[PDB]
């Protein structure tokens, strides 16, 4: 009789960028997941350890299409290793947000970590701006000359291939 604001998790005006994720906790909620399962607006709905027809930490962010497969246990890559590492039980749900996020001239409100000192631990969220040292000498505040600013932006735009489409990803961990 009391369904929680899944709509706030999914129908967000803005989504978090990887690097700066929106972590929401759901408690005291009817687990009516037929609402996500039977919805044709979603593409990926990959459930891990749980049947999708029977199915909480809701972690939301925007990722580019080639990297969608990285939001899974056992994966490697720029996102899986330096932004969001997953260990898990629950489902990864995603949808194509090109008509919402891809702005003319490019939507540059999303940022991801490219350079990192070490591989992330599961659910570690490193939100710092600390300079990557490269390894030949300490940077000492120097700009990125064989020294690197840790993150690169990623613009989304109306003309793109599949891997370049933005996706809104919500990970529902049980």
């Amino acid at each position, epitope marked *: 009789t009391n369904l929680c604001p899944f709509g706030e998790v999914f129908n967000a005006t803005r989504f978090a960028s990887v690097y700066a994720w929106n972590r929401k906790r759901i408690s005291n909620c009817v687990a009516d997941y037929s609402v996500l399962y039977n919805s044709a607006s979603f593409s990926t709905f990959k459930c891990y350890g749980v049947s999708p027809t029977k199915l909480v930490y809701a972690d939301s962010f925007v990722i580019r299409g080639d990297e969608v497969r990285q939001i899974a246990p056992g994966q490697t890559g720029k996102i899986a290793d330096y932004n969001y590492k997953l260990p898990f039980t629950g489902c990864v749900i995603a949808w194509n947000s090109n008509n919402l996020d891809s702005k003319v001239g490019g939507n540059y409100n999303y940022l991801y970590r490219l*350079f990192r000192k070490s591989n992330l631990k599961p659910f570690e969220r490193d939100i710092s*701006t600390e300079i990557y040292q490269a390894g030949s000498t300490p940077c000492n505040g120097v*700009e990125g*000359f064989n020294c690197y600013f840790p993150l690169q932006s990623y*613009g989304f735009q109306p003309t793109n291939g599949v891997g370049y489409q933005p996706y809104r990803v919500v990970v529902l961990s049980f």
Partner: antibody
Amino acid sequence: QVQLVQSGAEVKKPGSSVKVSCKASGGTFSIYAITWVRQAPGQGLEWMGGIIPIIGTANYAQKFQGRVTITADKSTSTAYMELSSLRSEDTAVYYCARDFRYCSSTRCYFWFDPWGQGTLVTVS
Amino acid sequence: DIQMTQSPSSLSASVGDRVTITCRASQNISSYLNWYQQEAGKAPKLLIYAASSLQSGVPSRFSGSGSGTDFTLTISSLQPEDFATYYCQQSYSTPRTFGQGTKVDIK
């Protein structure tokens, strides 16, 4: 499409201060960097300093440390610089650029594409 | 800091000729050299970055090669729109280093 738009000429005399700015379009305001360079009439072009707004601390050349403040406003998406204790030798055209970089593998290369117009300051 | 040496300081040429400009650093920096063109009354614009790629869309008027401490820029066939000054920047330090600059002159 980070077009920069900057202010026009200023004439405040030695002993006061001059504040200039460049408004940025496009996006990714918070990273890469806002840098300022200057050149005297006669292209003795030099870097003064710059800032990465997401960090907000800047990095300055030894010629302007304690003289020039470089900052940025994320909500205004604007580059700012102010020179204090003005001198006649400071006459120059001041410019903004974004320190755009391209990254691949483990290396990034930096150059300036989005140059502003140049702000002429003649304190005399 | 990085000492950016740019020479010849004067390169006259005719339209259709070739122009060769040297940009050598005292330091061995593998690929951070950029070339800029500055037209009268205007802010400078980038021609070549990271030693050899073009940014401006110029129809192959400018190109060059070299690495580490050295580099050479060539103008493939000089045009009227190119009678502008040029300079090198080596993007490998804080402060960034600029050379003294050069110019292509006319007959």
